[PDB]
């Protein structure tokens, strides 16, 4: 019921901001803040009003709210929006990140600003629609239309048409690397539906009847690779992640909040929801390749993070290290491991968003991007580097932050299922420390005479500090007290694991 | 260098922590004390890995 | 059979347009006026659209042994009529600046509409020939309209020799088939000996010139650079839209097209058309050559559906909707190109480097080119994506794995140049019928957006038309 | 050895091969109309050959 409205407010707000662009220029900032407030209101209403602590073994079909509507009846394509417990965590996270995106874009007036915000709400609404998606075509359409408006963001707002490096390399690799694999998973969807159409005799694009379709061995394996390729180019996996640092280092850091904190979520959401239950034996065969790619991703991202000299590419290469833990979590037979991935995933978004906001904040203070050029700014800034120290501290497994409990319950479940690949995996924490300290010492520890421009520094406004203070206190409560959201996700995680166990 | 070296030790410390939860279930010290001999009627070879890596 | 009133109501599209040529020719000889001729020609084409309703009152039937009128032909006549309507509205602003004899233009476009609406209705191999040539003679002569430039005459002459050459290949193939079979009627054909197949390959050569296929695509850049932009609207959309209907009907009806010997050859042509279009299309910095390069790839996607016409009945509506989406995308894009040449201006200076800016010059017109240019690619919220989606489904349905993979990698390669033109309209800057021309392209922009987001009503029309 | 990222470069070779192969196809076009008709004859030759091997 609430789901059609909850995916449509982003699109309605873009229309109204661009409508009132003719009326005024200070309107869309204040319009956008209220519209994202309504998005979190409906999302938090579903958290509180709904039975978040529901039955742990109520089957694979279980939803607090559900919407159905005929869209293309010839294939049974329907607007099958349906919200689960873990999907509701995703919706509340993106509503909060949308508030941060529209708050960081405050006091940013240009030649056109309504165009920026209709695009801003369009891309955030696309991610919400992926998170509420049970029909395969609706899932794919939303997956691919959140991908078009970021291209305009990197192009027309990466820099205003002055340098050609903001389109022809950064934005173009971002677009092609995702869309080729999106078309791969579309033909994977179609091969799965056609083998189901031979089995039963109805053209259906719905998840519940495609869940248990009879397929011979050696056939569903190729479709599982087809799903995983599109789910491995969106979250950074080892062979195909070259788009991520270019995308984050060129887009404005509000666009980078969208590009890191929430676009990385949807691929592991799809690995939990759409790839694991549909292909149980194929995923059981593919598991060790996934573990090898996971350990390679953690070690690889940390080394590339240590070796880099700038900051946006630095945090962009932390992200590929973080997601390796999540991939190994998903491809195991443990309930605790999956519940560790969820808390690690929410904390991943919350620990990347603050760093990107602050890295963009530091650049507009000093007008210099290279990290090794500055140094010793602690005597000049009064609140930026202290808050930045805790966010770099929250990146690695420091307890009292959500990242520690996240990565570390994965390791418990991972050692429960398989010893040797887990005992390799744990060493990324040592490597997490070295790139964390490298960031901290090269940027803030030292003498302010490392740069001439490090001798005249501005002040920090109240609202940026307010939205940084909220994230640090929110992230500490998730580290100390993670029970409420684990009780929320228990049943959804449990039935996925029980199906992955029982179907093999 | 101290930070790198102390986290190598902490990886070594958490290794035994995984093994103790896999073998004996509860991590409370006293409940561990009178749960350790109950669970160890048959196999003992893997406890040296837990304890050496705990050390 | 003789003439019955059912036959006249069925023939009403070919009739209203022919009566329009006579009235337009008499009006030219009476006054020689641009305003009256434009009004008279557009009224006749609008009268042909109105009379499409009246032939819809009539069922699926024959007029002569030459033609068969079905509901399939109703939709294809409609596509050709809107392209003819589109080209006259784009020609008035371009021809207002022309120095003299500004009135022969509508007469030739009207002849080409007769040719297009004659290839929609086809049942005999001769009607196939009366249609191809009726449309070529205006396209022989209209790319050479305004021959005062040094390249329009160049383009006309290159297209003239090559199109006569294709027609000679088609005619020689058309007879070498009829040597085996006792009749040239599509249905009566095929009633796999090598002479019939060899005759068939010759018709593929003569048909694949006009459909811009891989070893015959060499004309599509040059004349598209040389011809006037009003002619390019008709040459990109109407000719190949009308021609694709007759080549699909021949393979649907003829039992020889069921055999795999012709199927493999057409699939390789389709494979190479996508590849040899979308790789040479990157380097171009000219908008007219850029659209001409994309035309080769779009006709290739149509062929990868047509090869699986014989496996599953979804290929009929797939070809139909991609043709509808392809019409709207090219008309909007080529209308903006022609709308930039609001006077005659001698040689129009259009290039990809000449289209820096164009949002702070004319913002609405830049939005139309961007919407259509994203619709050509496969970006969603646009009708081109739904058309792309059915051809992928048809290739999946018929297990043509190399061909559907070619579309995806061809889409992957071809995304690049569409996106540059979309962003090049946002760099830093370096009369009444004109407003009517703006209305036509703006109307098409609204249509492609609402039928990309909401595509069901167009499918209802297509399944209404398909038999 | 990781100062430049290897796997980003080694999965860019599809773009490298496509752009270079696309440049070769553009150079294959001439503009001289005799070779256009030769393309038509050489398409007829290969279509008849491909039909006679079936």
PDB file of N, CA, C and O in Angstrom, chain C residues 239 286 383:
ATOM      1  N   UNK C 239      11.549   5.505 -46.498  1.00  0.00           N
ATOM      2  CA  UNK C 239      11.914   4.562 -47.544  1.00  0.00           C
ATOM      3  C   UNK C 239      12.161   3.182 -46.961  1.00  0.00           C
ATOM      4  O   UNK C 239      11.579   2.191 -47.412  1.00  0.00           O
ATOM      5  N   UNK C 286      30.465  14.511 -37.794  1.00  0.00           N
ATOM      6  CA  UNK C 286      29.398  15.117 -38.576  1.00  0.00           C
ATOM      7  C   UNK C 286      28.076  14.480 -38.186  1.00  0.00           C
ATOM      8  O   UNK C 286      27.983  13.254 -38.087  1.00  0.00           O
ATOM      9  N   UNK C 383      11.199   4.830 -26.148  1.00  0.00           N
ATOM     10  CA  UNK C 383      10.560   3.756 -26.892  1.00  0.00           C
ATOM     11  C   UNK C 383      11.565   2.850 -27.574  1.00  0.00           C
ATOM     12  O   UNK C 383      11.233   1.705 -27.889  1.00  0.00           O
TER      13      UNK C 383
END
